Amino acid sequence: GSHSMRYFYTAMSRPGRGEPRFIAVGYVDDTQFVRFDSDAASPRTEPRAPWIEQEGPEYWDRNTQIFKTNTQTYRESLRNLRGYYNQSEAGSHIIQRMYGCDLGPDGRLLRGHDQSAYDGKDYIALNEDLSSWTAADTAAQITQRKWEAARVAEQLRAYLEGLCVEWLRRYLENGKETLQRADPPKTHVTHHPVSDHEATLRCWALGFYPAEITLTWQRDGEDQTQDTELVETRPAGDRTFQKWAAVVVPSGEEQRYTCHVQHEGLPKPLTLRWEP
């Protein structure tokens, strides 16, 4: 199917408690494969998936060089952004950056990404053309001018169309037994009486990978979008994910309700009901 690679950078200032912390993590789809933390006893890029362990010392050294450089650069950037917003030196602030490449089912580049936020709010983003920027405000306009002078968009385009895709395809091959294996959800419906004439039907999906899943309840063939409690998809801790959808139903009407499950790992989409 479709695949993506993403790096997520978080840089966090902390006045009075040392220099800003820099954390970087890398993902292929819903699988983390690397980490770096400037707060570690001996900061170095570390493997987080078995299939990345085969990469040579030069890979790990180059990664560590990049993230150590970024640690220093983002500390300067935090100082810069504090100034752009006329903020005091006393407050803690966060820059986040998210970048990477999407591949279609055939393996070609679908699109590239490079987006930044400041204190949880969108700040600047590389446009889909990989040539121009969208700045959120007059502060981000300063950043835009800097990056246009340093030809950052051009450098990112070269990476996103080239090395990003090349490395992603390599990881997909090296980790094919997991990264290119969709695990279907194990599904069941539970029944929980709440009163004499109302009961909760909960539709469970367990042990699935990747995280993308559709879980809906239907009453007489009609979607119960407003009446359904749908929890956030959550990690099991073994690479797989869990989700449930619940609806409060009148007693004796349970068979009018159907749960519908859509996921990549299923040979066919599932229709489920409560089995007394």
Partner: peptide, 7 residues
């Protein structure tokens, strides 16, 4: 592999 500047 990550890409190899200030805001």
């Amino acid at each position: 592999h990550p890409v190899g500047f200030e805001y």
